[PDB]
Amino acid sequence: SCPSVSIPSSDEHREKKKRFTVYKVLVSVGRSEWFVFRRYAEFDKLYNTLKKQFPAMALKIPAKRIFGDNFDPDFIKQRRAGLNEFIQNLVRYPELYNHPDVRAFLQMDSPKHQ
């Protein structure tokens, strides 16, 4: 079927002198569903790759460079919203959800999903 996606939540991880937010993406294709876990940088690489290959789609992603606390929960919430709208637009077009970089991002061809 035509895939459906959402980004319901995010989680903070830390290592030493370091933190990062991990976005939980629910991906549904047909009668099945799974979880993909993506950092903003992973959305961004995809956005940059596809904005060049599909200019007229006027792809939009939330801001990359933040002047302020990039771990403000208000900020992360707005960012998640923007990323959700980003990917949810991606899966509307078969030109996109048959794109290899998109299918890998959402793990649409992993053998683990049967």
Task: Determine contact, residues 104/90, Cβ cutoff 8 Å.
Answer: no
Interhelix angle 40-53/73-90, nearest 10 degrees:
40
What is the C-alpha to C-alpha distance for residues 23 and 12, in angstroms, rounded to an integer? 9
CA 18 from centroid of its chain's CA atoms: 22
CATH number at residue 92: 3.30.1520.10
DSSP one-letter string for the chain = ---EEEEEEEEEEEETTEEEEEEEEEEEETTEEEEEEE-HHHHHHHHHHHHHH-GGG------SS-SS-TT-HHHHHHHHHHHHHHHHHHTT-HHHHTSHHHHHHTT-S-GGG-
Method: X-ray
What is the C-alpha to C-alpha distance for residues 73 and 37, in angstroms, rounded to an integer? 18
Task: Determine contact, residues 97/3, Cβ cutoff 8 Å.
Answer: yes
What is the residue range of 22's domain?
Answer: 1-114
Tokens in use for 64? 């990359």
Task: Determine contact, residues 6/88, Cβ cutoff 8 Å.
Answer: yes
**Header resolution in angstroms:** 2.0
Query: What is the count of structural domains for the chain?
Result: 1
